[PDB]
Design a protein around this ligand. Structure first.
Ligand SMILES: Nc1ncnc2c1ncn2[C@@H]1O[C@H](COP(=O)(O)OP(=O)(O)OP(=O)(O)O)[C@@H](O)[C@H]1O
Ligand SMILES: [Co+2]
Ligand SMILES: [Co+2]
Ligand SMILES: [Co+2]
Length: 336
């Protein structure tokens, strides 16, 4: 029939819509969603979300209502998913990777390989950076039997954007079972600073802060002598025995370089303070792929609203069921 979704679910952001689009294309099940981001400062469909809808529409030849900027209602009726070479432009500093997050799962079930290229923002503060997708998520997808490779072609910063991200995807031959338990011992911690159109000395200060708190196996400075810009992100990649995570902070307008590294340090020690293998963000991004695979599990310290939202949406579209059991401040998310 028709699946009616409440956009106010969880934190009431764009996540429910992106996950809905993915699952609708895959299952063929049509859906309607009201109150899309209705509680936000900038409510309704933004350029990122509209581009996500337009991308999903082009890929499966969908019947759509309300695909417009600021629209808080969408009706989406999917058709047949087609593999191929796709290109989309957000037209702002909107997250390229979140647009990719939307349509990539559908292409896992295509006839042949596909490629999707999206232009826009590349290092948004509240989205997975292309480097996170490539180095954290995708190695885990591969273990599940999903083959996609993401490449950042060009960096785009707020507010101009102009960045470019592309992903290559092959159809899934066979799904597998990935079971992530405790995080296990730390193998390496790599610190990285991205610079573009901002003072050079900034990077050296930020790395010094990191090394004092963890001692980095790598201290990397990546200058972008182009515009590009202006932009600055500080990352910390945490490689443990059974998993690799990555945390980042975007150096902003007013804030000093000394503190942006410090708040990254706090965020990382928070992750380290738990035995949880998966961070709060990666947790919500593993729900759909594990659901589609029919099995799998992971541990996370504190299940976010986006995590629980993705679970709820999945359960509406798929016959899979998630159990969430907490053991000593750590939550095991498993498919029953
Ligand atoms: N630092 C981070 N590293 C990796 N992934 C992240 C990070 N921050 C956010 N994400 C991911 O980006 C997505 C955020 O979804 P969400 O809909 O909340 O976007 P948003 O930027 O909060 O905008 P809004 O919520 O207003 O729509 C989630 O999948 C989350 O896991
Ligand atoms: Co949000
Ligand atoms: Co490098
Ligand atoms: Co780079």
């Amino acid at each position: 029939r028709m699946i009616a979704l409440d956009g106010a679910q969880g934190e009431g952001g764009g996540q429910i819509l992106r996950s809905a689009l993915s699952l609708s294309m895959i299952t063929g099940q049509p859906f309607t969603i009201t109150s899309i981001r209705a509680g936000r400062a900038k409510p309704g469909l933004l350029r990122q979300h509209l581009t996500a809808v337009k991308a999903a529409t082009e890929i499966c030849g969908a019947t759509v209502e309300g695909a417009e900027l600021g629209s808080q209602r969408l009706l989406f009726r999917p058709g047949t998913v087609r593999g191929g070479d796709y290109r989309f432009a957000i037209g702002s500093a909107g997250s390229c990777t979140l647009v990719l997050q939307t349509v990539l799962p559908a292409l896992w079930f295509a006839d042949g390989p596909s490629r999707v290229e999206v232009s826009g923002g590349t290092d948004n503060p509240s989205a997975p950076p292309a480097d996170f997708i490539r180095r954290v998520l995708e190695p885990l997808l591969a273990k599940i039997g999903i083959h996609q490779q993401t490449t950042l072609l060009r960096h785009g910063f707020y507010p101009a954007g102009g960045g470019v991200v592309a992903t290559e995807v092959s159809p899934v031959a066979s799904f597998n079972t990935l079971q992530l338990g405790e995080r296990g011992n730390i193998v390496q911690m790599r610190g990285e600073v991205l610079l573009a159109g901002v003072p050079r000395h900034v990077a050296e200060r930020e790395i010094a802060t990191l090394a004092g708190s963890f001692s980095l196996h790598e201290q990397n400075i990546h200058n972008l002598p182009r515009d590009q810009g202006p932009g600055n992100t500080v990352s910390l990649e945490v490689e443990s025995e059974n998993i690799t995570e990555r945390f980042f902070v975007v150096g902003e307008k007013r804030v000093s370089a000394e503190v942006v590294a410090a708040q990254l340090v706090k965020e990382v020690k928070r992750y380290l303070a738990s035995t949880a293998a998966v961070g709060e963000y990666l947790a919500d991004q593993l729900v759909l792929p594990m659901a589609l695979a029919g099995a799998g599990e992971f541990t996370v310290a504190h299940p976010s609203s986006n995590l629980l939202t993705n679970i709820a949406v999945v359960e509406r579209f798929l016959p899979v069921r998630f159990s969430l059991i907490e053991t000593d401040g750590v939550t095991r998310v498993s498919i029953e």
